[model samples]
Target: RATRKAREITSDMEEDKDLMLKLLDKNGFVLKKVEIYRSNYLAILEKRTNGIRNFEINNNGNMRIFGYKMMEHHIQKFTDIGMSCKIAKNGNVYLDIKRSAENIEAVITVASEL
Candidate 1:
């Protein structure tokens, strides 16, 4: 099933040459290679100009951080807005937003047993 879906997506990409190029240009991604594992598909994209490691996990998780200059740029932008955020010692960010106390309750919770 995964292979079939991958094939379909690849075929669509092949049919639309401009779309493929646009995607690469928009995200500053270069097509490295495509690989398939047990029941998953992976597309390796790379960028070299900005010296940042950009990767997508399962087409969902995306991680990217520019060099020092980019970090400074983001900090300046954040300061420009009234909002402020910071990472805790445990690496969690606290975002300040207005919300009703009762409406902010969590429905389901998970615990990890070490």
Candidate 2:
């Protein structure tokens, strides 16, 4: 079966907020505040538009985007940024993105371009 599996990994990190903002700034992602989970670090990102994007990263540099509204418009663009699209049985879609300065930049570039 070529069906996609709904695999999810939660991130647990304790990095400095100031440094994290700086890192995101360098990657073209604006720090739109954060949400502290019991065992996870979730950050909200806003590019050039009012709509924001959700980004998750772990201490090991693993990253993922649950689902971006704009991404739904141009799903193929994700592949151009080296992201693989996966769908869960519950009808949820996600983008598997690598954690790297360059890759993060590419995701923002594509996001705003849409």
- RMSD in Å for all candidates: 14.4, 8.4
- All candidates: TM-score: 0.26, 0.55
lDDT (CA) for every model shown?
A: 0.30, 0.57
Q: How close is candidate 1 to the true structure, as a TM-score?
A: 0.26
In terms of lDDT, the poorest run of 10 residues in model 1 is 105-114
**Model 1 lDDT per residue over 22-49, tens place:** 4444544565664444322333445422
Model 2 accuracy (lDDT, Cα): 0.57
- Collision pairs in model 2: none
Top of the candidates by lDDT: 2
How much does candidate 2 score in TM-score? Answer: 0.55
Alpha-carbon runs more than 4 Å astray in model 2: 1-32, 45-53, 68-73
The candidate 2 region of ten consecutive residues with least summed lDDT is 9-18
How well does candidate 2 score on lDDT at residue 104?
62
